[PDB]
Design a binder for these strands. Structure first.
Lengths: 138, 214, 311, 214, 138, 138
RNA sequence: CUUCUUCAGGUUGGACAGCUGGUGCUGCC
């Protein structure tokens, strides 16, 4: 219930505000391309990241178990691997992950292993997508 | 005297019964299925099963047509499902129950959960653009053990009551239960239909089984 | 309104299209005694290995080479028939099998040319008009191109790829192909409103002319005419019934700008666009002919015909 | 009544229908098919069949001009498929069901799986860059045995309904069922089409078969 | 659920981290060749290896079995054949395979003969490649 | 009481009048879209707002704590995130969310952290939907 | 001994939203 986004602990009530801060910071000061250009992360890529989070959240949510089992933690480690792959492929995705603590959040969930920790992580990612849609637009 | 109608409801296709209480995320599910709040186990509400069975049976028994109000159905439906009409109140001889799925251990043997996610969409015939949804659905092969209470009030027309009970069950078998049935979902089957005496013993209880199993 | 004009594929030339790749002779036999080649199945091979040497011992003896023509009958002395599914004769005109290409084949062994491959082919054919409608055009997004149907199994024949530039030097990559005079059929239907029979006839005629009279004659006469002639008949002007179906034939069928320009101008634009690709300068894209068993006949890999009939 | 429209659909070219909710791997498969959760068998969603049939039948019954809202179609389409038009809400006569793969035995003897993975391309004539994808397609040669229930609201509206159903099935033959259908995938064929009554017998049901089995 | 590659490999909280540290150890000390180090093994060698593992994985996923069939075992044997040949081609592939214990994982999944170990190993190799793209490039 | 809105203050006695004023301001001068307007929000789009609020009202209506629990606060923050997200999807919704200052009320509820504050906010939203009814329809 | 391993859009949209019936009667000063 106490995520560790970056250097600031994230509780169960400031996920929306901190995700809004993350999106506004990226929107105000965006990533600079290698070839002297400006671009953001597309809605398709963040939607794919949310889908990845939705794959595991759809099975976690239909439970009352306090701690996630080994299969859920395996899927979370796999999602972290895919996060690393996306970061290594497109530098804008790496920038989006690094400006947030999406890797640090997934590592905190992996270390906590509790159901409520991943529930807060899903809330935070959902709010990131929400404030991308609100601020970035379409 | 009172009788208990046991039996199992087996899903043939995915079955979705709506009702939503909390926390529908923006990329995960748009229509969850009704679940037992404590155990999180999906269930078939007795209201929905009773309503679908009553609709099918009332339509079948009347003329094949059914446009009336529930308190003006046929006398068999009125005496078996109840009637709230001012001067003519029929007390229901059936008490449906909420039906939780029973074979969760059997499902876990196959390394699956009891619910799936179904991805649908609608395509606007103008621009051919798709609008996706995400329906939670109880997987086919799920089994729901049920119990219906029959209040044995009239000792003689119990046989016709049970013939109509079996007829409604069979109407459900060639129809859907809950949710988007015409679009593939909702198919069910009935098995192990057995009536037993709640307390004591009933003279025609071996007859009531053979008019339920056949 | 949509109609149905059944079309066939008399693939007079051998065909190649990509669906995968395979490495050196580690699961296929390239014999040289009676000049035949072989490709293995899976399940019978698994059972054979189960009733023979262990899989780790099989693995531990690869040091490149590992040729399967001199091992299965010499180091094992057993019949290769249980481990062949589309065995195929080979005749080449001499640099050894460096690597082998795999035509795309569905799960039942059989080869076919998938959908969207014919859509790319008909894009480079019928897109002679403009160069803007590649995503939203109804000429394909309202067309319904289908897969190819059965391509015969007894018509498989391995072929050598050769060079055309003033010498017939063999090239390292070889490939099993489909022998000539084989007939394939389709069921490809289309509408009339935005793909008109007179329009498609005009399109095929104009693309055929802009290929033959404009480009092909200059290439044939530019470097060598006697190289093709052993026969090199190449029937022509027959209502435009020529299709470069498949691949491994040339870069002209891939880039479509020389059907609406002049020879010098089209080659100038081609030079401008190919300066960004590769570091070798060349006047034109040299051909890759083959040899058929002997009559030294050079034929471009991937020919076909077009015909339309009701229902 | 409860007429039951049975039959079989066979794929001529590999058909793709999506709706998986599993982790796509780095190089394994970028888009798998929809399958049953318990039996892991490829699935044809009866919603997909119903939607494609409604589109194809509606457009051919609208002179090849389909532009309206689904609830704003001709009367026959609504009375077969249903509509929530405000006053005269029409119940769907056709009850499609999620169709599961049936011929796994012959495929198993053929040493083949029910699905294959195809690599095609995303190549460009411009700066030469290709974006390879991985489409999982149900093997061509797959049979899906279906059962579509039917409601006989009026005996006048049975032969028209069934001839329209047969022509809707035969319009799918010169078309695909779903997925990347414009690019050589999804070709389907219907065989063993027929109909039977769920309960009892129906007069002139052979007229339905002679316009549905031929 | 449990893999042996010499360092008590686990499905949960273990495969991604261990693949990442193997990739880092590869990159921390570049391979030594004649006569210059830092060969920079491209994705072309790493792919193909991934392609074989993933075609076997594709055939495995649509199979609900606790144990892998003899066909899958022969597929893994052919995987080992391909890896041995590719390593023999040039020494940098030898270094990549040895340091990441690809052959050890193959032998362990060949000994265990269950779908769980094979899916764990495929997940592990995908982790190797994802972290290679994350900490490397191309 | 003490529910800030942005330009005024709605206490426990003054939610219905403000809701009717906001609905009249909505009914007057309808929204302007790309094509000059002009359609108004649907009953099943203020639906979503109403069930979103009720999904916490049902859990707070039956209790006696003066301050809302951390689980209720998390769900209110999630309502704020959701209403931010869905406003970006449709403009006819965003004008409803802006002209009727939902976000300020939610933020004040999250700042007061008291049961009565959220009850007043829910009463305001319910009155807003009730007043949209009997003026429009459809 | 090469060259990308998927990219870009739609993430639910409308329809109904609680109706009918009872509704303190009897016993005591």
């Amino acid at each position: 219930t106490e995520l560790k986004i970056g250097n600031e602990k994230v509780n169960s009530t400031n996920f929306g505000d901190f995700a809004e801060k993350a999106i506004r910071g990226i929107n105000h000061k965006p990533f600079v391309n290698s070839k002297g250009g400006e671009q953001k992360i597309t809605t398709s890529k963040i939607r794919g990241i949310l889908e990845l989070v939705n794959k595991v959240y759809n099975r976690v949510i239909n439970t009352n178990d306090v701690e996630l089992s080994e299969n859920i933690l395996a899927d979370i480690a796999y999602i972290k691997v895919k996060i690393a792959y996306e970061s290594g492929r497109e530098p804008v995705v790496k920038d989006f992950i690094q400006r947030t603590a999406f890797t640090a959040a997934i590592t905190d969930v992996m270390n906590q292993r509790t159901r409520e920790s991943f529930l807060l992580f899903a809330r935070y990612v959902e709010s990131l997508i929400a404030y991308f849609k609100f601020y970035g637009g379409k | 005297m009172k009788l208990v109608i046991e039996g199992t409801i087996v899903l043939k296709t995915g079955m979705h019964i709506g009702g939503s209480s909390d926390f529908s995320a923006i990329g995960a599910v748009d229509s969850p299925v009704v679940r037992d709040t404590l155990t999180r186990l999906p269930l078939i509400p007795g209201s929905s099963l009773k309503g679908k069975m009553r609709y099918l049976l009332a339509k079948e028994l009347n003329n094949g047509i059914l446009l009336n109000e529930p308190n003006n159905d046929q006398d068999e439906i009125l005496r078996l499902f109840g009637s709230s009409e001012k001067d003519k109140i029929r007390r229901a001889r059936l008490k449906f129950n909420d039906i939780k799925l029973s074979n969760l251990a059997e499902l876990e043997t196959f390394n699956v959960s009891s619910t799936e996610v179904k991805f649908e969409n609608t395509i606007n015939r103008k621009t051919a653009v798709a609008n996706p949804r995400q329906i939670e659905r109880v997987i086919a092969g799920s089994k729901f053990d049920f119990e219906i209470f029959y209040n044995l009030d009239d000792i003689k027309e119990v046989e016709k009551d049970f013939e109509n009970i079996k007829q409604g069950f069979d109407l459900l078998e060639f129809d859907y239960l809950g949710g988007h049935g015409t679009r593939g979902s909702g198919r069910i089957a009935f098995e192990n239909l057995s009536v037993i005496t709640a307390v004591g013993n009933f003279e025609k209880i071996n007859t009531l089984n053979e008019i339920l199993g056949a | 309104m949509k109609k149905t004009y059944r079309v066939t594929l008399t693939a007079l030339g051998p065909i190649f299209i990509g669906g995968g790749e395979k490495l050196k002779k580690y699961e296929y036999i390239f014999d040289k005694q009676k000049k035949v080649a072989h490709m293995i199945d899976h399940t019978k091979f698994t059972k054979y290995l189960l009733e023979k040497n262990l899989l780790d011992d099989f693995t531990s003896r690869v040091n490149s080479h590992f040729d399967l023509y001199d091992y299965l009958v010499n180091k094992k002395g057993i019949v290769f028939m249980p481990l062949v599914k589309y065995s195929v004769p080979v005749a080449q005109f001499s640099p050894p099998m460096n690597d082998l290409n795999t035509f795309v084949k569905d799960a039942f062994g059989r080869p076919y040319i998938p959908g969207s491959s014919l859509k790319g082919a008909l894009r480079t054919a019928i897109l002679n008009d403009l160069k803007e409608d590649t995503k939203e055009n109804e000429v394909f997004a309202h067309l319904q191109v289908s897969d190819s149907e059965t391509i015969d199994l007894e018509n498989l024949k391995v072929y050598q790829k050769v060079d055309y530039s003033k010498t017939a030097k063999p090239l390292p990559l070889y490939r099993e192909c489909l022998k000539p005079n084989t007939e394939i059929t389709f069921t490809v239907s289309f509408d009339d409103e935005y793909l008109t029979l007179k329009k498609i006839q005009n399109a095929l005629h104009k693309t055929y002319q802009h290929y033959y009279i404009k480009w092909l004659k200059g290439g044939k006469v530019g470097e060598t005419l006697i190289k093709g002639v052993f026969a090199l008949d190449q029937p022509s002007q027959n209502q435009g019934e020529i299709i470069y179906i498949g691949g491994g034939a040339g870069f002209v069928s891939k880039t479509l700008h020389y059907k609406s320009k002049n020879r010098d101008q089209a080659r100038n634009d081609s030079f401008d666009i190919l300066k960004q690709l590769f570091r070798t300068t060349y006047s034109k894209m040299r051909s890759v002919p083959d040899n058929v068993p002997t009559g030294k006949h050079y034929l471009e890999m991937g020919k076909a015909r077009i015909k339309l009939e009701e229902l």
